[PDB]
Design a binder for this molecule. Structure first.
Ligand SMILES: Nc1ncnc2c1ncn2[C@@H]1O[C@H](COP(=O)(O)OP(=O)(O)O)[C@@H](O)[C@H]1O
Ligand SMILES: Nc1ncnc2c1ncn2[C@@H]1O[C@H](COP(=O)(O)OP(=O)(O)O)[C@@H](O)[C@H]1O
Ligand SMILES: [Cl-]
Ligand SMILES: [Mg+2]
Ligand SMILES: [Mg+2]
Ligand SMILES: [Mg+2]
Lengths: 235, 235
């Protein structure tokens, strides 16, 4: 099974990772109120409304009633209301769902972020190798399998000691292989450590961050942040 | 009498003005919770903790026990806790208070903003003219009275028709006299209109925005925002 994005991000935050969990809403009225209250802190900010469904490919999916996209930018709380009203109580159709679509009864309302870089990072049990592995790449061709077949050099696989877990040396090297320098190296190290603790201590079969981002804070500091999150379990 | 900053800013927002009302906290532990929850929306952002006291000169004031400043930057929720712990339940000393200081039992927790320009703008009851007047300047010499005496030409005065309120022509010119262009012109017009409706509909004796700011949103859009606010009434 999988848990929803906002819950996965909350779990990551509990273990010390930086992730935009936003706030969940079960009505367009609530979504509007969330956005309106956020304008008390960052007046004029834009918003993103993300359908919370147990399926991927939301950004490029489309709703049964016509609207395009499960991840949509909004300029105002009223636009947040309108967008959320087309998601909540309706059926989203993506690549992963097929024509059958998937029901949505809730969204995440978050602030729109300035994104400088997007990475893919996942942690799973690699049966072939017999150990957990951290997989990551800086390519933006979406499909992780697509990049793997068109550019094997683009994918970094880090085998993890089943017993001791990741070592600082492994994570520092991965951070530099992804092109990070300066404070972002240790920032990425700390975030991947948190992600591995989620994977390990929560008995997950996969922790997948697509994308793991370099973002700018409202005062332009560059930090690592999970922009999407999917955590799977065996039940 | 006067009301607190956050109450004045909430009033401005009710009438359509853009103002950072933040969120008020009546205890240090609540101040921490507010900052921590804000990292769900703008992960990595810095914070500002503003003592809510009925006195000016907070920025340069100092607390009875040593801490400097009634408006303080903080990097983390725990720093917000530490700062709020020295403000809530303690005595702040500013120019306006004298050595007797003033008690503080609550703070505003705000997101740290990127501030590009700071203006002064006030709306007063002018008895010599028998009508309200808007006074504004782009100078940063703190003392409005100081700037007024050393550079009267730096101050722009706009008499207001009580029957019609500020006109688009008056406000467009004021916005350009303050150095604004592009979308900020209309932005400033709409905000000053709201400020006048506050002044008029709430029967205020003074609405003073020091500073009225040009800020950047988290995605770098330039918008007008009230960064401080003082609204006076007669008992
Ligand atoms: N807060 C945000 N601000 C701006 N863009 C965002 C934000 N969160 C996500 N995005 C963008 O939206 C895209 C799609 O969202 P995502 O969470 O990856 O869902 P999915 O994989 O189902 O399409 C991301 O690849 C990212 O580029
Ligand atoms: N959210 C914020 N981020 C950064 N600077 C801020 C923020 N809010 C206010 N400031 C700055 O703090 C200074 C002092 O705050 P202010 O509200 O004017 O208090 P006071 O005038 O009573 O000292 C202002 O000149 C303004 O530029
Ligand atoms: Cl963190
Ligand atoms: Mg994704
Ligand atoms: Mg001030
Ligand atoms: Mg910026």
């Amino acid at each position: 099974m999988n848990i929803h994005e906002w819950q996965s991000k909350q779990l990551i935050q509990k273990y010390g990772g930086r992730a935009q969990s936003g706030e969940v809403a079960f009505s367009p009225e609530r979504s509007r109120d969330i956005a309106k209250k956020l304008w008390n802190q960052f007046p004029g900010c834009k918003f993103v409304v993300k359908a919370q469904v147990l399926a991927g490919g939301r950004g490029k999916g489309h709703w049964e009633h016509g609207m395009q996209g499960g991840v949509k930018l909004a300029k105002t709380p009223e636009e947040v209301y309108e967008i959320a009203n087309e998601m909540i109580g309706h059926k989203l159709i993506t690549k992963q769902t097929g024509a059958k679509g998937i029901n949505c009864n809730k969204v995440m309302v978050c602030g729109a972020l300035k994104i400088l870089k997007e990475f893919y990072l996942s942690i799973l049990l690699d049966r072939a190798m017999g150990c957990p592995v951290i997989i990551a790449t800086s390519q933006g061709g979406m499909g992780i399998e697509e990049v793997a077949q068109k550019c094997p050099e683009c994918l970094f696989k880090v085998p993890i000691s089943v017993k001791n877990g990741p070592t600082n040396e492994q994570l520092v090297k991965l951070a530099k292989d992804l092109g990070l320098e300066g404070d972002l190296v240790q920032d990425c190290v700390d975030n991947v450590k948190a992600l591995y603790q989620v994977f390990d201590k929560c008995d997950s079969t996969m922790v997948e961050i697509n994308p793991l981002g370099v973002i700018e804070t409202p005062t332009d500091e560059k930090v690592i942040c999970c922009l999407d999150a999917k955590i799977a379990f065996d039940k």
